[PDB]
């Protein structure tokens, strides 16, 4: 364990559980999902098991939800200040807009807190203007490509941008731009410009995606690296 990682070992353990609830409304359809999982914050991995509690079956691609289901689960080198791990135990919140190539839009916010050895998320997600015959409402997506999020400070908080690609049945893709604001609930040491490389996948699901397992890996690095 490195010097920088040890500074938060008192609060964020090498294994942490996850509990979450999402209230959502996509093209007018309301739903609730609850999740439980676990991850390794210093390895940058996390796994969440999700269940649709209200509004089943979902009439849209589950992929527009998966990146809403916590950058505390990011491997960070010691020379890049770790905005997310520093924020705990108090935690942080984030706000995000995802703009889709066919003018669908998702707006989502999340509150990330900590209780004992668990992170707790409260998520609200709204999707609007998805064309009914587009790949989101027709459930013709396969998953997200690997991505690189650009992290940089503005207005005393951390911003993250992703030029993303939603992969489609048949081999095509759908451009999606992510913009996120991450707000620590206390003063932390702020990082310079850097990257976070992501890979998110659905490992398992039942036919209607009422039950889904999501996995994500995330690693921070400098642009030179």
């Amino acid at each position: 364990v490195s010097k920088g990682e040890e500074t938060t070992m008192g609060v964020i353990k090498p294994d942490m559980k996850i509990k979450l609830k999402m209230e959502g409304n996509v093209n007018g359809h309301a739903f609730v999902i609850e999740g439980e999982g676990e991850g390794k914050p210093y390895d940058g991995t996390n796994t969440i098991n999700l269940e649709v509690k209200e509004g089943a079956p979902l009439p849209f691609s589950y992929d527009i939800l998966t990146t809403a289901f916590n950058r505390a689960f990011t491997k960070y080198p010691d020379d890049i200040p770790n905005y997310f791990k520093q924020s705990f135990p108090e935690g942080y919140s984030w706000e995000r807009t995802m703009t889709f190539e066919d003018k669908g839009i998702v707006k989502v916010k999340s509150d990330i807190s900590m209780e004992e050895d668990s992170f707790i998320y409260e998520i609200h997600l709204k999707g609007e203007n998805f064309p009914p015959n587009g790949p989101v409402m027709q459930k013709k997506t396969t998953g997200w490509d690997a991505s690189t999020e650009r992290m940089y400070v503005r207005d005393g908080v951390l911003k993250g941008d992703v030029k993303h690609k939603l992969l489609l049945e048949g081999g095509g893709h759908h451009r999606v731009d992510f913009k996120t604001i991450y707000r620590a609930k206390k003063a932390v040491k702020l990082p310079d410009y850097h990257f976070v490389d992501h890979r998110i996948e659905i490992l398992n699901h039942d036919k209607d995606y009422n039950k889904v397992t999501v996995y994500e890996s995330a690693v921070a690095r400098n642009s030179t690296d």
Binding site: E23, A30, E54, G55, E95, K107, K109, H124, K126
Partner: protein, 163 residues
Amino acid sequence: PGSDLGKKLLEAARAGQDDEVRILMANGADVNATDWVGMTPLHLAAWKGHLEIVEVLLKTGADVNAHDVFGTTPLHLAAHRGHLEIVEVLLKAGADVNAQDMVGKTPLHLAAYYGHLEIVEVLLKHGADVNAQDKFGKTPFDLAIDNGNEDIAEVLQKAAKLN
């Protein structure tokens, strides 16, 4: 429309910097400045529990019934957090006691879920609908039961009796 003073006012309300809020308003800040998820200074002051700032924002023209992109009003936020005096001030200023958010929840749903009995009683007194169903068919009573708020559940069950 977005403005530089508006952005600073949103941040001052978000940060609970009451004196800075007053300075910004004095210099023309738009009291109804709105961020990219629909939050206004009144939303933020209501959530943070800063009663004096809620009052001056309402006095200088803040929209008491503004909703964010998830359908949440300042009254929702104050009922959620248990801010009794702010709930009273918002209602006095015209807040819609039965406003529903994007999943159909009213302020009474939230007060019941989060266990704020005094707020439950204030909302009821001003005509909150005890039988209101969210988009999943659930009433405030259901949410009080779900979260083990038994005293609130009794208040709501008694109030649901019709004649």
